[PDB]
Amino acid sequence: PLMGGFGLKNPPPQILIKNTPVPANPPAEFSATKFASFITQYSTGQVSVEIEWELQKENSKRWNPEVQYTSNYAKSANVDFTVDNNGLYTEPRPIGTRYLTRPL
Amino acid sequence: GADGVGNASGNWHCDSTWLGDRVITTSTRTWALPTYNNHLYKQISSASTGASNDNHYFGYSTPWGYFDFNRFHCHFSPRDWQRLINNNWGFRPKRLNFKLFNIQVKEVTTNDGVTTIANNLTSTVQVFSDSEYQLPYVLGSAHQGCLPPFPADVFMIPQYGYLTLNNGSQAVGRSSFYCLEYFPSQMLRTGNNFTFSYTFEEVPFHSSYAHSQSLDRLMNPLIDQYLYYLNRTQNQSGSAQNKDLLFSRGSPAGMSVQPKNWLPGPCYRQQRVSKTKTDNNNSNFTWTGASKYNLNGRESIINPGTAMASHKDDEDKFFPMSGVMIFGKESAGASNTALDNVMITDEEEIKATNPVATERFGTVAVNFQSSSTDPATGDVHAMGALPGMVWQDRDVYLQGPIWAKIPHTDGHFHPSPLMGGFGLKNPPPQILIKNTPVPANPPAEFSATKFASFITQYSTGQVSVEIEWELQKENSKRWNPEVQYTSNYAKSANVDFTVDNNGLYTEPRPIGTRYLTRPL
Amino acid sequence: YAHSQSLDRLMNPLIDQYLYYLNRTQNQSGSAQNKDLLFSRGSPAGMSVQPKNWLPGPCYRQQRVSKTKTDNNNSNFTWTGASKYNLNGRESIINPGTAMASHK
Ligand SMILES: CC(=O)N[C@H]1[C@H]([C@H](O)[C@H](O)CO)O[C@@](O)(C(=O)O)C[C@@H]1O
Numbered sequence: 001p002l003m004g005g006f007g008l009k010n011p012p013p014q015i016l017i018k019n020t021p022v023p024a025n026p027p028a029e030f031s032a033t034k035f036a037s038f039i040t041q042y043s044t045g046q047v048s049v050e051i052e053w054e055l056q057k058e059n060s061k062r063w064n065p066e067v068q069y070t071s072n073y074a075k076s077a078n079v080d081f082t083v084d085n086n087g088l089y090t091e092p093r094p095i096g097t098r099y100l101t102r103p104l
Numbered sequence: 105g106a107d108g109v110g111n112a113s114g115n116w117h118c119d120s121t122w123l124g125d126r127v128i129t130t131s132t133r134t135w136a137l138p139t140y141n142n143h144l145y146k147q148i149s150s151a152s153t154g155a156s157n158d159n160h161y162f163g164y165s166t167p168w169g170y171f172d173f174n175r176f177h178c179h180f181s182p183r184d185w186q187r188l189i190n191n192n193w194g195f196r197p198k199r200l201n202f203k204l205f206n207i208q209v210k211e212v213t214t215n216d217g218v219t220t221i222a223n224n225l226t227s228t229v230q231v232f233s234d235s236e237y238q239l240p241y242v243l244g245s246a247h248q249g250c251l252p253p254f255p256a257d258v259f260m261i262p263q264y265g266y267l268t269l270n271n272g273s274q275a276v277g278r279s280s281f282y283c284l285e286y287f288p289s290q291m292l293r294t295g296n297n298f299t300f301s302y303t304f305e306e307v308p309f310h311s312s313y314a315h316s317q318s319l320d321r322l323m324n325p326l327i328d329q330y331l332y333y334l335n336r337t338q339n340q341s342g343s344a345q346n347k348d349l350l351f352s353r354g355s356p357a358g359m360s361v362q363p364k365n366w367l368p369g370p371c372y373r374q375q376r377v378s379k380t381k382t383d384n385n386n387s388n389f390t391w392t393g394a395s396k397y398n399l400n401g402r403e404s405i406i407n408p409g410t411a412m413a414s415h416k417d418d419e420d421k422f423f424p425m426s427g428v429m430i431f432g433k434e435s436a437g438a439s440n441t442a443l444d445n446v447m448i449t450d451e452e453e454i455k456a457t458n459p460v461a462t463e464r465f466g467t468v469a470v471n472f473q474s475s476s477t478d479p480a481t482g483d484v485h486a487m488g489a490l491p492g493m494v495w496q497d498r499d500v501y502l503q504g505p506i507w508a509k510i511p512h513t514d515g516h517f518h519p520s521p522l523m524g525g526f527g528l529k530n531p532p533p534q535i536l537i538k539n540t541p542v543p544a545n546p547p548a549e550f551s552a553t554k555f556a557s558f559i560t561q562y563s564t565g566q567v568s569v570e571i572e573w574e575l576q577k578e579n580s581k582r583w584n585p586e587v588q589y590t591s592n593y594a595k596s597a598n599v600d601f602t603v604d605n606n607g608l609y610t611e612p613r614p615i616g617t618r619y620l621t622r623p624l
Numbered sequence: 625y626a627h628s629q630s631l632d633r634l635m636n637p638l639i640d641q642y643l644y645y646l647n648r649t650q651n652q653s654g655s656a657q658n659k660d661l662l663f664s665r666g667s668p669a670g671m672s673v674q675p676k677n678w679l680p681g682p683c684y685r686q687q688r689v690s691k692t693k694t695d696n697n698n699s700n701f702t703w704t705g706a707s708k709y710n711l712n713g714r715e716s717i718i719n720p721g722t723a724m725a726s727h728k
């Protein structure tokens with residue numbers, strides 16, 4: 001997939017969720033016209049996702065140290081990848097995956 | 105079934121599974137049931153009003169409502185209809201599975217302008233099916249209130265009423281009154297569910313085909329017959345007009361006089377009216393020129409009547425006045441709406457076997473010709489069953505009825521329900537549903553006078569119907585391609601059989617079943 | 625037994641039909657008598673025009689005669705006005721004939 005990732009013949013499928021409509025009180029005489037009057041309602045719940053990933057171990061015979069991703073040892077007003085004083089989490093930079101190296 | 109209040113009692117089973125010679129459809133819809141009639145039965149009459157003797161009626165309205173899944177779009181999605189009509193020669197019902205679940209009774213309180221609707225967790229809706237057909241069968245009369253075509257559409261449950269004998273507005277000693285509290289019925293709180301299953305009797309497959317041949321074109325066009333017919337009664341090659349008796353044998357150059365084995369179907373002519381208003385008479389003849397029947401000094405139009413072709417070859421503009429089924433579009437009003445708010449069906453593909461409804465049946469001798477008395481023929485406008493007759497019953501439509509109960513009579517001739525479908529000795533039974541009345545607070549002193557004060561309440565739930573249909577496969581040895589039903593490849597602002605931008609599903613044309621063909 | 629219901633009174637009197645029938649051929653609410661094609665759906669206020677599934681039984685009409693001699697014709701019609709059948713150039717009265725109701 002051009003934006004990065006795994007192109008799948010049969011990916012994980014979509015999970016469609018809907019609240020069942022709850023009609024409010026119909027008239028006392030019959031009316032075959034579509035029902036347009038419903039209790040306003042919303043739902044909340046939790047959702048759980050467990051994913052097992054395989055890892056490919058690094059077997060590199062490189063002598064010198066590789067480049068590694070690291071938070072900045074030095075001081076600053078904000079830890080990286082945290083809430084601030086209002087409670088807002090913020091992701092400060094994009095983190096990719098290519099840090100270890102191997103021969104071509 | 106027994107379940108806590110917080111515990112679904114059924115799942116949303118809706119689907120479309122084909123296997124071999126069988127198609128199993130299942131459709132689930134959600135229903136609203138109100139209190140009807142204020143938990144009362146009420147005698148209903150044509151009293152007052154002054155409705156014409158034809159319209160006089162006597163009967164009852166009931167606190168119960170009923171379920172009605174007697175239309176094909178209840179269980180066949182249009183694309184499934186296409187699979188049926190495009191590849192099968194026939195089909196019929198076989199079994200049925202019904203379920204009531206997730207029922208929620210709610211209480212309603214109105215104070216000033218504001219209304220509040222809360223859950224009543226102890227209230228019960230009661231369902232029972234009339235499996236012994238002890239109640240007047242009101243299904244099979246093309247009423248509204250059926251399951252909606254679009255599964256996401258929520259429908260109100262129609263109210264049950266019936267009728268009995270009436271002389272004018274008055275009743276008669278034999279007329280019958282039915283209390284649905286007299287039958288045993290299943291009571292359900294929000295935790296309970298309800299189910300039953302039904303088997304259809306053996307009935308013939310419906311004719312999802314047209315004839316590639318007509319009754320008058322069954323012979324071999326290359327081979328004279330050995331039969332002879334009287335050809336002339338006045339001499340050919342005579343200088344005067346001299347009497348003769350000249351016989352000719354059957355020949356392809358005259359298919360119209362060849363002896364034949366069969367007769368077309370029965371006819372009961374109806375008035376022909378054009379879809380273009382100009383050609384029609386300047387009068388209001390839909391009653392005075394109506395073909396009607398006469399029962400107990402009371403006239404009732406015949407519609408749709410004996411199954412006949414709708415127009416002949418190249419006369420597409422006509423239709424029988426009461427001899428075709430007409431579906432209203434969603435926009436159409438209830439009375440006196442224009443031509444383009446309705447959809448008129450065209451049963452023209454049966455002109456192969458059946459008379460055209462607007463025309464005579466044939467001609468009949470009505471005297472004894474002699475040298476003195478000129479021969480005479482008259483036209484036939486009503487033709488009852490004759491030996492030899494073959495006929496094709498009126499076709500079914502996605503929007504049309506599925507079945508009907510055959511009246512319980514000493515006698516019936518070819519009891520296909522006239523509006524199309526399967527005539528059943530023991531159809532699927534009615535399912536009657538009612539909300540149990542919930543009395544409000546009685547007085548603190550006793551009063552034996554009938555209780556008239558109840559919590560206003562309505563109920564909602566889902567309903568599930570699974571039907572297994574048999575299919576009759578097409579075995580045709582036709583070389584050329586058959587006619588098939590198809591959406592229009594070209595562009596347009598609206599897909600067929602869809603919601604529009606306001607969310608309204610609309611069925612754009614009536615779809616019948618006769619597309620494949622077989623020999624006669 | 626007798627039927628507590630009649631063929632033209634089998635429908636539900638509280639529920640319009642979804643079927644439509646051609647109602648008028650001359651315009652309602654027109655100053656003249658102008659041609660029109662107006663359609664109405666089945667309604668309890670008109671049981672007589674609702675599409676129906678069945679037909680009454682076969683009929684073969686017979687002459688009506690009153691039990692009170694005055695109302696009847698001053699002639700001897702029990703043969704000349706008889707409904708009869710014709711077999712081998714020989715006439716024979718139909719009695720009792722196709723099963724029909726005796727009076728309305
Ligand atoms: C094939 C056909 O319809 N034949 C019919 C003919 C034709 O009208 C003439 O042969 C015209 O050439 O007319 C008849 O009166 C005749 O003369 O015997 C009756 C016969 O049924």
Ligand SMILES: CC(=O)N[C@H]1[C@H]([C@H](O)[C@H](O)CO)O[C@@](O)(C(=O)O)C[C@@H]1O
Nearest residue numbers: 159388390391647648669670671672673
């Ligand atoms: C219920 C009923 O019998 N309706 C009939 C009406 C009534 O006679 C008028 O509505 C009188 O109010 O007359 C028609 O010609 C019409 O106007 O459509 C035919 C229709 O069958």
Ligand SMILES: [Mg+2]
Nearest residue numbers: 119120121122
């Ligand atoms: Mg499937």
